Amino acid sequence: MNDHEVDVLVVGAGLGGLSTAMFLARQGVRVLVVERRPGLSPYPRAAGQNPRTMELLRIGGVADEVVRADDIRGTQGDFVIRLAESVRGEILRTVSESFDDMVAATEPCTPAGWAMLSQDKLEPILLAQARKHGGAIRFGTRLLSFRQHDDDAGAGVTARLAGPDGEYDLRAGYLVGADGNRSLVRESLGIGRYGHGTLTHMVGVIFDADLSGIMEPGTTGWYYLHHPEFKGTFGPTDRPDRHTLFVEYDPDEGERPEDFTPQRCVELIGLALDAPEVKPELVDIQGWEMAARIAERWREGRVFLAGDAAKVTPPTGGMSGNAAVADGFDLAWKLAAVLQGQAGAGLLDTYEDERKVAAELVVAEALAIYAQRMAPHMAEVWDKSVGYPETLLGFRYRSSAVLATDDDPARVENPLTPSGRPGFRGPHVLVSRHGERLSTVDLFGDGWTLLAGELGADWVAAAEAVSAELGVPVRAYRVGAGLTDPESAVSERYGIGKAGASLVRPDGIVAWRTDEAAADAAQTLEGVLRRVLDR
Ligand SMILES: Cc1cc2nc3c(=O)[nH]c(=O)nc-3n(C[C@H](O)[C@H](O)[C@H](O)COP(=O)(O)OP(=O)(O)OC[C@H]3O[C@@H](n4cnc5c(N)ncnc54)[C@H](O)[C@@H]3O)c2cc1C
Ligand SMILES: CC[C@@]1(O)C[C@H](O)c2c(cc3c(c2O)C(=O)c2c(O)cccc2C3=O)[C@H]1C(=O)OC
């Protein structure tokens, strides 16, 4: 039989696809992205990288390019978030007072912070890093259909593509559908979505205008507009002369995208800024229906949904791109481990179990923010916010790859007062290696990391015995030994006492822990690893 031609075929070159590819390629996986478009879009779309995204971009080795690249903050390096009636006008409520304060809000639970690139800046950095690690991409190439092949006859997926020289077949070991909300992939498998559904409709206008005259210095940021005439939002880009405006509209009242003529648009831009000296130059006028939809299934056989295809969230709270990047990270490291023989196929089921709950957390937070910031009258239709940082940083996973003892139904915890329980991020704690001062969080992501208590030298020896046994990297660090704890807080935050240990996954999530010593640390650790990796 024939070697697959590629290990993974990723469909779509938005953030979900380029993430999955960059993190697959870094792991030595042969991955091909195909993209129907002739090139990456220059449009801003989703902007801003949250601290969880930043933690994964760090793992992925692109964090330093991300920080150097052009962001959307103003020339004074600041960014404000506000409800107002008009942009240059009087503030109804301030969500974030500055950028330094936005970062400050979660700094004690993470060493990563925020970045502020638009989608068109971030995608080129993903794509470049995928390519440097051996990934490949084909533009102007469209997926027509695919067939699947059971393990006897393969296993694999045969996909049919429409490129420039016409049609052809490609065999992959896996197919990832990162092909957007109207996903050819999801729709082809006949998978339904659930959730609130249509939320609202809005028209986006990207436009050019020098606001140097009508906006006071340092006033760059995101604005929720509650104007007598209209409902909307207003945003910066990475060019000081380019901006975005969104305006709500009712189709049931008879309003249509067609009504937002260049005229209406310049008019509403006039209104939003409360300056009519403005002559904008309109770049794009695009109607958008906002919704909340989650795929019933994130996987059928060797086909996976990732990104918007798996879940559409209202854009409110800037989580759209950040969730795709994270779906991709999860998919990557689990696919890599299975493809290399480090795990059995059972691990792939954790993808859905974990990222499908994450999708629900993201959507719920987005609806709640829509209510609090755009539609205060809707706050009851949906559960109240569980908290922004608890959703992005305090989230918990349950699956076969999380060995939890308790059964607390809570899906988040305060990330500022962490438990160290399985399923949550291993807590941020400042420690140092022999002089190098780092967060416990910066210790994660190569393969598996194990943290042992002061007395747990047996756990350290096990980390090597088990790596060798299973062929998985286990980096082990012991407190008071090769890892300095000045405040003596690692044991306490991770809940490992003096003699226990905490096993942390490739995405920085705690898989397992104990607060005491095992009878045979190597036997126990092997058993724990065999289980979460499906061996
Ligand atoms: C037009 C547009 C505007 C957006 N604006 C905003 C915004 O202002 N603010 C915000 O926060 N978020 C916005 N987003 C949403 C945000 O971009 C996405 O949530 C983020 O990109 C994650 O989505 P994704 O990559 O999974 O899918 P997408 O970003 O939709 O990428 C899917 C890609 O798959 C490609 N594709 C589709 N079908 C095929 C096929 N059959 N074969 C090959 N390729 C295919 C598409 O060309 C597209 O490039 C917008 C998205 C779109 C599509
Ligand atoms: C700091 C970054 C941040 O996440 C701040 C905030 O969370 C936010 C962002 C983005 C959007 C919306 C946000 O509220 C938002 O409401 C929205 C919307 O209602 C309708 C369409 C698009 C958007 C939308 O693109 C992100 C941002 O400011 O990017 C420029």
CSV table of C-alpha atoms in Angstrom, one decimal, residues 64-501:
chain,number,residue,atom,x,y,z
A,64,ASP,CA,9.2,37.4,20.1
A,65,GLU,CA,8.1,38.1,16.5
A,66,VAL,CA,4.6,38.8,17.8
A,67,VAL,CA,5.9,41.3,20.2
A,68,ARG,CA,8.0,43.1,17.6
A,69,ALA,CA,5.3,43.3,15.0
A,70,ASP,CA,3.0,46.2,14.4
A,71,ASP,CA,0.0,46.3,16.8
A,72,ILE,CA,-3.1,48.2,16.9
A,73,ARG,CA,-2.3,50.4,19.9
A,74,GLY,CA,-1.8,54.2,19.5
A,75,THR,CA,1.5,56.0,19.2
A,76,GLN,CA,1.5,56.4,22.9
A,77,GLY,CA,1.4,52.6,23.1
A,78,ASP,CA,-2.0,52.7,24.8
A,79,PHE,CA,-5.5,51.3,24.3
A,80,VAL,CA,-8.7,52.1,26.0
A,81,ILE,CA,-12.1,50.3,26.1
A,82,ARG,CA,-15.3,52.3,26.6
A,83,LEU,CA,-19.0,52.6,26.3
A,84,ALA,CA,-19.9,56.1,24.9
A,85,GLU,CA,-22.6,57.8,22.8
A,86,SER,CA,-20.0,58.9,20.3
A,87,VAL,CA,-16.4,58.3,20.0
A,88,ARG,CA,-15.1,61.9,20.7
A,89,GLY,CA,-17.6,62.4,23.4
A,90,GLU,CA,-18.7,61.6,26.9
A,91,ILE,CA,-18.0,58.2,28.4
A,92,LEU,CA,-21.0,56.1,29.6
A,93,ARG,CA,-18.7,53.5,31.3
A,94,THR,CA,-15.0,52.6,31.0
A,95,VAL,CA,-14.3,48.9,30.6
A,96,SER,CA,-10.5,49.3,30.5
A,97,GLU,CA,-8.8,52.5,31.4
A,98,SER,CA,-5.5,51.8,29.7
A,99,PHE,CA,-3.4,48.9,28.2
A,100,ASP,CA,-0.9,48.6,31.1
A,101,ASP,CA,-4.0,48.0,33.3
A,102,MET,CA,-5.5,45.5,30.9
A,103,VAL,CA,-2.3,43.4,31.3
A,104,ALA,CA,-2.2,44.1,35.0
A,105,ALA,CA,-5.6,42.5,35.5
A,106,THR,CA,-4.3,38.9,34.9
A,107,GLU,CA,-0.5,39.4,35.5
A,108,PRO,CA,-0.6,37.5,38.7
A,109,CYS,CA,-1.9,34.3,37.0
A,110,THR,CA,0.4,34.5,34.0
A,111,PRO,CA,3.8,35.7,32.7
A,112,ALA,CA,2.4,36.1,29.2
A,113,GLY,CA,0.5,39.4,28.6
A,114,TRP,CA,-1.4,40.7,25.7
A,115,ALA,CA,-0.4,41.4,22.1
A,116,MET,CA,-2.4,43.5,19.8
A,117,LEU,CA,-1.9,42.5,16.2
A,118,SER,CA,-4.7,42.3,13.7
A,119,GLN,CA,-5.3,39.0,12.0
A,120,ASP,CA,-3.4,40.1,8.9
A,121,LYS,CA,-0.3,40.6,10.9
A,122,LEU,CA,-0.6,37.4,13.0
A,123,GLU,CA,-1.3,35.0,10.1
A,124,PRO,CA,1.9,35.8,8.2
A,125,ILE,CA,3.9,35.0,11.4
A,126,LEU,CA,2.1,31.6,11.8
A,127,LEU,CA,2.5,30.8,8.2
A,128,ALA,CA,6.2,31.6,8.2
A,129,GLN,CA,6.9,29.4,11.2
A,130,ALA,CA,5.0,26.5,9.8
A,131,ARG,CA,7.1,26.8,6.7
A,132,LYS,CA,10.3,27.0,8.6
A,133,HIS,CA,9.4,23.8,10.3
A,134,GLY,CA,8.5,22.1,7.0
A,135,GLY,CA,4.9,22.8,6.5
A,136,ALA,CA,3.5,23.9,3.1
A,137,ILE,CA,0.6,25.7,1.7
A,138,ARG,CA,-1.3,25.9,-1.5
A,139,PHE,CA,-3.3,28.9,-2.4
A,140,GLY,CA,-6.1,29.1,-5.0
A,141,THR,CA,-6.9,25.5,-4.0
A,142,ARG,CA,-10.4,24.4,-3.0
A,143,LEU,CA,-11.6,21.2,-1.4
A,144,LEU,CA,-14.4,19.6,-3.4
A,145,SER,CA,-15.0,16.4,-1.3
A,146,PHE,CA,-13.4,13.6,0.6
A,147,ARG,CA,-13.8,9.9,1.3
A,148,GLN,CA,-12.7,8.0,4.4
A,149,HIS,CA,-10.8,4.7,4.7
A,150,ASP,CA,-11.1,2.3,7.7
A,151,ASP,CA,-7.9,1.1,9.3
A,152,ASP,CA,-7.8,-2.2,7.4
A,153,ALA,CA,-7.9,-0.4,4.0
A,154,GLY,CA,-5.7,2.5,5.3
A,155,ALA,CA,-6.3,4.2,7.5
A,156,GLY,CA,-6.8,7.7,5.9
A,157,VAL,CA,-8.8,10.3,4.0
A,158,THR,CA,-8.8,10.9,0.3
A,159,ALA,CA,-9.6,14.5,-0.6
A,160,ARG,CA,-10.4,16.0,-3.8
A,161,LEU,CA,-9.1,19.5,-4.5
A,162,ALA,CA,-9.6,22.1,-7.2
A,163,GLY,CA,-6.4,23.9,-7.9
A,164,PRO,CA,-5.3,26.0,-10.9
A,165,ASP,CA,-4.4,23.1,-13.1
A,166,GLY,CA,-7.8,21.6,-12.3
A,167,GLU,CA,-8.8,18.7,-10.1
A,168,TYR,CA,-6.7,16.1,-8.2
A,169,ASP,CA,-6.7,13.6,-5.3
A,170,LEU,CA,-4.6,13.8,-2.1
A,171,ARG,CA,-4.3,11.1,0.6
A,172,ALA,CA,-3.9,12.3,4.1
A,173,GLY,CA,-3.8,10.4,7.4
A,174,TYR,CA,-6.1,13.2,8.8
A,175,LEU,CA,-8.3,16.0,7.5
A,176,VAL,CA,-8.8,19.1,9.5
A,177,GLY,CA,-11.7,21.4,8.6
A,178,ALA,CA,-10.6,24.9,9.4
A,179,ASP,CA,-12.7,26.1,6.6
A,180,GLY,CA,-14.9,28.6,8.4
A,181,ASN,CA,-18.5,29.1,9.7
A,182,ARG,CA,-20.1,27.8,6.4
A,183,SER,CA,-17.8,24.8,6.6
A,184,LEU,CA,-17.8,22.6,3.6
A,185,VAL,CA,-16.3,20.0,5.9
A,186,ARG,CA,-18.9,20.1,8.8
A,187,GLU,CA,-21.8,20.4,6.4
A,188,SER,CA,-20.5,17.5,4.3
A,189,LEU,CA,-20.5,15.2,7.3
A,190,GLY,CA,-24.0,16.3,8.1
A,191,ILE,CA,-23.2,17.6,11.6
A,192,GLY,CA,-25.7,19.9,13.2
A,193,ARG,CA,-24.9,22.9,15.4
A,194,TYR,CA,-26.6,24.0,18.6
A,195,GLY,CA,-26.8,27.2,20.7
A,196,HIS,CA,-28.6,30.5,20.8
A,197,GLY,CA,-28.2,30.9,17.0
A,198,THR,CA,-28.6,34.2,15.3
A,199,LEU,CA,-27.8,37.1,17.7
A,200,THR,CA,-27.8,40.3,15.6
A,201,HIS,CA,-26.8,41.7,12.3
A,202,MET,CA,-24.2,44.5,11.7
A,203,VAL,CA,-22.4,46.2,8.9
A,204,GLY,CA,-18.7,46.6,9.1
A,205,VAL,CA,-17.0,49.5,7.4
A,206,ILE,CA,-13.2,49.7,7.2
A,207,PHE,CA,-12.4,53.3,6.2
A,208,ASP,CA,-9.5,55.8,6.0
A,209,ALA,CA,-9.5,59.2,7.6
A,210,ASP,CA,-7.0,61.4,9.4
A,211,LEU,CA,-8.5,61.8,12.8
A,212,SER,CA,-5.5,63.7,14.1
A,213,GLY,CA,-7.9,66.7,14.2
A,214,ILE,CA,-10.9,65.3,16.1
A,215,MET,CA,-9.5,62.8,18.5
A,216,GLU,CA,-7.6,63.9,21.6
A,217,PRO,CA,-4.1,62.4,21.9
A,218,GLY,CA,-3.8,58.9,23.5
A,219,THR,CA,-7.5,58.1,22.8
A,220,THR,CA,-7.1,55.0,20.7
A,221,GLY,CA,-9.2,52.0,21.6
A,222,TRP,CA,-12.4,50.0,21.2
A,223,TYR,CA,-15.7,51.8,21.5
A,224,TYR,CA,-19.1,50.5,22.1
A,225,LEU,CA,-21.4,53.1,20.6
A,226,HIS,CA,-24.8,53.8,22.1
A,227,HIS,CA,-25.9,56.7,19.9
A,228,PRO,CA,-29.4,58.2,19.6
A,229,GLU,CA,-29.4,57.1,15.9
A,230,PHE,CA,-27.6,53.7,15.9
A,231,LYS,CA,-26.0,50.9,17.8
A,232,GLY,CA,-22.3,50.0,17.1
A,233,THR,CA,-18.7,49.7,17.8
A,234,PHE,CA,-15.6,51.5,16.6
A,235,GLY,CA,-12.0,50.5,16.4
A,236,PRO,CA,-8.4,51.3,15.5
A,237,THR,CA,-6.0,49.3,13.2
A,238,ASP,CA,-2.2,49.2,13.0
A,239,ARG,CA,-2.2,52.2,10.6
A,240,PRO,CA,-2.9,55.5,12.3
A,241,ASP,CA,-5.1,56.5,9.3
A,242,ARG,CA,-7.3,53.4,9.1
A,243,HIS,CA,-10.3,52.5,11.3
A,244,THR,CA,-13.3,50.2,11.5
A,245,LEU,CA,-16.9,50.9,12.3
A,246,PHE,CA,-19.8,48.5,12.9
A,247,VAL,CA,-23.4,49.4,12.9
A,248,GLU,CA,-26.3,47.3,14.1
A,249,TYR,CA,-29.4,46.8,11.9
A,250,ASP,CA,-32.7,45.0,12.1
A,251,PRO,CA,-33.7,42.8,9.2
A,252,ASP,CA,-37.2,42.2,10.8
A,253,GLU,CA,-37.7,45.9,10.7
A,254,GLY,CA,-36.9,45.8,7.0
A,255,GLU,CA,-33.3,47.0,7.0
A,256,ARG,CA,-30.7,45.4,4.7
A,257,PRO,CA,-27.0,45.6,4.0
A,258,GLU,CA,-27.9,47.1,0.5
A,259,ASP,CA,-29.0,50.3,2.5
A,260,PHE,CA,-25.6,51.0,3.7
A,261,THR,CA,-24.6,52.9,0.7
A,262,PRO,CA,-21.2,54.8,0.6
A,263,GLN,CA,-23.5,57.6,1.6
A,264,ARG,CA,-25.1,56.2,4.6
A,265,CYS,CA,-21.7,55.0,5.7
A,266,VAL,CA,-19.8,58.3,5.5
A,267,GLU,CA,-22.9,59.7,7.2
A,268,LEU,CA,-22.8,57.2,10.1
A,269,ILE,CA,-19.0,57.7,10.3
A,270,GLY,CA,-19.8,61.4,10.7
A,271,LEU,CA,-22.3,60.6,13.5
A,272,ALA,CA,-20.0,58.1,15.2
A,273,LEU,CA,-17.2,60.6,15.4
A,274,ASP,CA,-19.4,63.8,16.0
A,275,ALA,CA,-17.2,65.5,13.4
A,276,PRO,CA,-18.5,66.4,9.9
A,277,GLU,CA,-15.1,67.8,8.6
A,278,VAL,CA,-14.7,64.1,7.8
A,279,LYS,CA,-14.3,62.8,4.3
A,280,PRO,CA,-13.5,59.2,4.8
A,281,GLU,CA,-12.4,56.8,2.0
A,282,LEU,CA,-14.4,53.6,2.4
A,283,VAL,CA,-12.3,50.5,2.0
A,284,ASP,CA,-15.0,47.8,2.6
A,285,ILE,CA,-18.7,47.6,3.5
A,286,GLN,CA,-19.6,44.1,4.7
A,287,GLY,CA,-22.8,42.8,6.3
A,288,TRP,CA,-22.2,40.2,9.0
A,289,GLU,CA,-24.7,38.1,10.9
A,290,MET,CA,-23.5,37.4,14.3
A,291,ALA,CA,-24.4,34.2,16.0
A,292,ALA,CA,-23.6,31.5,18.5
A,293,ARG,CA,-23.3,28.0,17.0
A,294,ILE,CA,-21.4,24.9,18.2
A,295,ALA,CA,-20.8,21.8,16.2
A,296,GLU,CA,-22.5,18.8,17.8
A,297,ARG,CA,-19.3,16.8,17.0
A,298,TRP,CA,-15.8,17.9,16.4
A,299,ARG,CA,-14.6,14.7,14.8
A,300,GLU,CA,-15.8,11.9,12.6
A,301,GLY,CA,-13.2,9.2,12.1
A,302,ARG,CA,-10.1,11.0,10.8
A,303,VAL,CA,-11.9,14.3,10.0
A,304,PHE,CA,-11.8,17.2,12.5
A,305,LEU,CA,-13.5,20.5,12.9
A,306,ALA,CA,-11.4,23.4,14.3
A,307,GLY,CA,-12.0,27.1,14.6
A,308,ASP,CA,-15.1,28.8,13.3
A,309,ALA,CA,-16.2,25.5,11.6
A,310,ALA,CA,-16.5,24.0,15.1
A,311,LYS,CA,-17.9,27.1,16.7
A,312,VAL,CA,-19.0,30.6,15.9
A,313,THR,CA,-19.1,33.1,18.8
A,314,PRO,CA,-20.3,36.6,18.8
A,315,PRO,CA,-17.2,38.8,18.2
A,316,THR,CA,-17.9,40.5,21.6
A,317,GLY,CA,-14.9,40.3,24.0
A,318,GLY,CA,-12.4,39.6,21.1
A,319,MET,CA,-12.2,35.8,21.6
A,320,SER,CA,-12.9,34.7,18.0
A,321,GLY,CA,-9.3,34.4,16.8
A,322,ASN,CA,-8.0,33.5,20.2
A,323,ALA,CA,-10.3,30.3,20.3
A,324,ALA,CA,-9.2,29.2,16.8
A,325,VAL,CA,-5.5,29.5,17.8
A,326,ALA,CA,-6.2,27.4,20.8
A,327,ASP,CA,-8.3,24.7,19.0
A,328,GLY,CA,-5.3,24.4,16.7
A,329,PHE,CA,-2.9,24.0,19.5
A,330,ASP,CA,-4.9,21.3,21.1
A,331,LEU,CA,-5.4,19.4,17.8
A,332,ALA,CA,-1.7,19.7,16.9
A,333,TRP,CA,-0.1,18.2,20.0
A,334,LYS,CA,-2.6,15.4,20.3
A,335,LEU,CA,-2.3,14.6,16.6
A,336,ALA,CA,1.5,14.7,16.8
A,337,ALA,CA,1.6,12.3,19.7
A,338,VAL,CA,-0.7,9.8,17.9
A,339,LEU,CA,1.2,10.1,14.7
A,340,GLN,CA,4.5,9.5,16.3
A,341,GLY,CA,3.4,6.4,18.2
A,342,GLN,CA,3.4,8.3,21.6
A,343,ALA,CA,-0.3,7.8,22.2
A,344,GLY,CA,-3.1,5.6,21.0
A,345,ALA,CA,-6.1,6.9,19.1
A,346,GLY,CA,-8.1,7.3,22.3
A,347,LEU,CA,-6.3,10.6,22.9
A,348,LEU,CA,-7.9,12.1,19.9
A,349,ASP,CA,-11.3,11.8,21.6
A,350,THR,CA,-10.1,14.3,24.2
A,351,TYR,CA,-10.1,16.9,21.5
A,352,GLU,CA,-13.8,17.2,21.4
A,353,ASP,CA,-14.4,16.6,25.1
A,354,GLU,CA,-12.1,19.4,26.0
A,355,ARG,CA,-12.4,22.0,23.2
A,356,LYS,CA,-16.1,21.5,22.9
A,357,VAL,CA,-16.6,22.6,26.5
A,358,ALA,CA,-14.1,25.5,25.9
A,359,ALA,CA,-16.3,26.6,23.0
A,360,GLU,CA,-19.3,26.7,25.3
A,361,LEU,CA,-17.3,28.8,27.8
A,362,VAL,CA,-16.2,31.2,25.1
A,363,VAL,CA,-19.7,31.7,23.6
A,364,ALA,CA,-21.3,32.2,27.0
A,365,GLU,CA,-18.7,34.8,27.9
A,366,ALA,CA,-19.3,36.5,24.5
A,367,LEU,CA,-23.1,36.6,24.9
A,368,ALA,CA,-22.7,38.0,28.5
A,369,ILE,CA,-20.4,40.7,27.2
A,370,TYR,CA,-22.8,41.5,24.3
A,371,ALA,CA,-25.5,42.0,27.0
A,372,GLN,CA,-23.4,44.1,29.4
A,373,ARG,CA,-21.9,46.3,26.6
A,374,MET,CA,-24.3,46.4,23.7
A,375,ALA,CA,-27.7,45.1,24.9
A,376,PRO,CA,-28.3,45.6,28.7
A,377,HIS,CA,-31.9,44.6,28.1
A,378,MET,CA,-30.9,41.1,27.2
A,379,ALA,CA,-28.9,40.2,30.3
A,380,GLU,CA,-31.5,37.6,31.3
A,381,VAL,CA,-31.9,35.8,28.1
A,382,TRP,CA,-28.5,34.2,28.9
A,383,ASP,CA,-26.5,33.3,32.1
A,384,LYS,CA,-24.5,36.0,33.6
A,385,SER,CA,-20.7,36.2,33.0
A,386,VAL,CA,-18.6,33.7,34.9
A,387,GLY,CA,-15.8,36.2,34.5
A,388,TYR,CA,-13.4,37.1,31.7
A,389,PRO,CA,-10.2,35.7,33.3
A,390,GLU,CA,-12.0,32.6,34.6
A,391,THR,CA,-13.1,31.9,31.1
A,392,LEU,CA,-9.7,32.5,29.4
A,393,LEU,CA,-7.3,31.4,32.1
A,394,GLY,CA,-9.3,29.7,34.9
A,395,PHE,CA,-11.0,27.1,32.6
A,396,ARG,CA,-11.1,23.5,33.4
A,397,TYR,CA,-10.9,20.4,31.1
A,398,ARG,CA,-12.4,17.0,31.7
A,399,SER,CA,-11.5,14.0,29.6
A,400,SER,CA,-9.6,10.7,29.5
A,401,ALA,CA,-6.5,12.9,29.6
A,402,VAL,CA,-7.4,14.5,33.0
A,403,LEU,CA,-7.1,12.3,36.1
A,404,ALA,CA,-9.3,14.3,38.5
A,405,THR,CA,-10.3,12.8,41.9
A,406,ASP,CA,-13.1,15.2,42.8
A,407,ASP,CA,-16.2,15.8,40.9
A,408,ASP,CA,-16.9,19.5,41.2
A,409,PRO,CA,-19.1,20.4,38.3
A,410,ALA,CA,-17.6,23.9,38.0
A,411,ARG,CA,-16.0,24.7,34.6
A,412,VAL,CA,-13.9,27.6,35.8
A,413,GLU,CA,-12.1,28.7,39.0
A,414,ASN,CA,-10.7,32.1,39.9
A,415,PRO,CA,-7.4,32.0,38.0
A,416,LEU,CA,-6.0,34.4,40.6
A,417,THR,CA,-6.5,31.9,43.5
A,418,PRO,CA,-5.8,28.6,41.7
A,419,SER,CA,-6.4,25.1,43.1
A,420,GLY,CA,-3.7,23.2,41.2
A,421,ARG,CA,-6.5,20.5,40.5
A,422,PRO,CA,-6.2,18.4,37.4
A,423,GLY,CA,-7.7,20.0,34.4
A,424,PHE,CA,-6.7,23.6,35.1
A,425,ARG,CA,-3.5,25.4,34.0
A,426,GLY,CA,-0.6,24.6,36.2
A,427,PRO,CA,-0.4,27.9,38.3
A,428,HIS,CA,1.9,30.7,37.6
A,429,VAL,CA,4.6,30.9,40.2
A,430,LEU,CA,7.9,32.8,40.1
A,431,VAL,CA,10.8,30.5,40.7
A,432,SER,CA,14.4,30.4,39.2
A,433,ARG,CA,16.7,27.9,37.7
A,434,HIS,CA,20.1,28.5,39.2
A,435,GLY,CA,19.7,32.2,38.6
A,436,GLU,CA,17.3,32.4,35.8
A,437,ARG,CA,14.1,33.7,37.1
A,438,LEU,CA,11.0,32.3,35.3
A,439,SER,CA,7.3,31.4,35.7
A,440,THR,CA,6.5,27.8,36.3
A,441,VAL,CA,4.3,28.4,33.2
A,442,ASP,CA,7.4,29.0,31.0
A,443,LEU,CA,8.6,25.5,32.1
A,444,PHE,CA,5.8,23.9,30.0
A,445,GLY,CA,5.3,22.9,26.4
A,446,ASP,CA,8.3,20.9,25.2
A,447,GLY,CA,6.7,17.6,26.1
A,448,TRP,CA,5.5,16.7,29.6
A,449,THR,CA,6.7,18.5,32.6
A,450,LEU,CA,6.7,17.1,36.1
A,451,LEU,CA,7.0,19.1,39.3
A,452,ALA,CA,8.1,17.3,42.4
A,453,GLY,CA,8.0,18.3,46.0
A,454,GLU,CA,11.2,18.9,48.1
A,455,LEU,CA,11.5,15.3,49.1
A,456,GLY,CA,10.3,13.8,45.8
A,457,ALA,CA,13.7,12.8,44.3
A,458,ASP,CA,12.1,9.5,43.5
A,459,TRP,CA,9.6,11.3,41.2
A,460,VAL,CA,12.6,12.9,39.4
A,461,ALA,CA,14.2,9.5,38.8
A,462,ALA,CA,10.8,8.2,37.5
A,463,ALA,CA,10.5,11.0,35.0
A,464,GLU,CA,13.5,9.7,33.2
A,465,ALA,CA,12.5,6.0,33.6
A,466,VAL,CA,9.1,6.6,32.1
A,467,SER,CA,10.3,8.9,29.3
A,468,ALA,CA,12.7,6.2,28.2
A,469,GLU,CA,9.9,3.6,28.6
A,470,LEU,CA,7.2,5.3,26.6
A,471,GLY,CA,9.3,7.5,24.3
A,472,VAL,CA,7.8,10.8,25.6
A,473,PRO,CA,9.7,13.8,26.9
A,474,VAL,CA,9.3,14.2,30.7
A,475,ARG,CA,11.2,17.1,32.1
A,476,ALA,CA,11.3,16.8,35.9
A,477,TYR,CA,12.0,19.7,38.3
A,478,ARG,CA,12.3,19.4,42.0
A,479,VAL,CA,11.7,22.2,44.5
A,480,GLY,CA,14.6,23.3,46.7
A,481,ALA,CA,16.8,21.3,44.3
A,482,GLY,CA,17.2,22.4,40.7
A,483,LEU,CA,14.3,24.8,41.0
A,484,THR,CA,14.5,27.5,43.6
A,485,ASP,CA,11.4,28.5,45.5
A,486,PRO,CA,12.2,31.8,47.5
A,487,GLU,CA,8.7,32.2,48.8
A,488,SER,CA,8.2,28.4,49.1
A,489,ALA,CA,4.9,28.5,47.0
A,490,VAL,CA,5.0,25.8,44.4
A,491,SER,CA,4.1,22.9,46.7
A,492,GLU,CA,1.2,25.0,48.0
A,493,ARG,CA,-0.1,26.2,44.7
A,494,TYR,CA,0.1,22.9,42.8
A,495,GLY,CA,-1.0,21.0,45.9
A,496,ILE,CA,1.9,18.6,46.0
A,497,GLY,CA,3.1,19.1,49.6
A,498,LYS,CA,6.7,18.0,50.3
A,499,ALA,CA,6.5,14.4,48.8
A,500,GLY,CA,4.0,14.7,45.9
A,501,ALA,CA,4.2,15.6,42.3
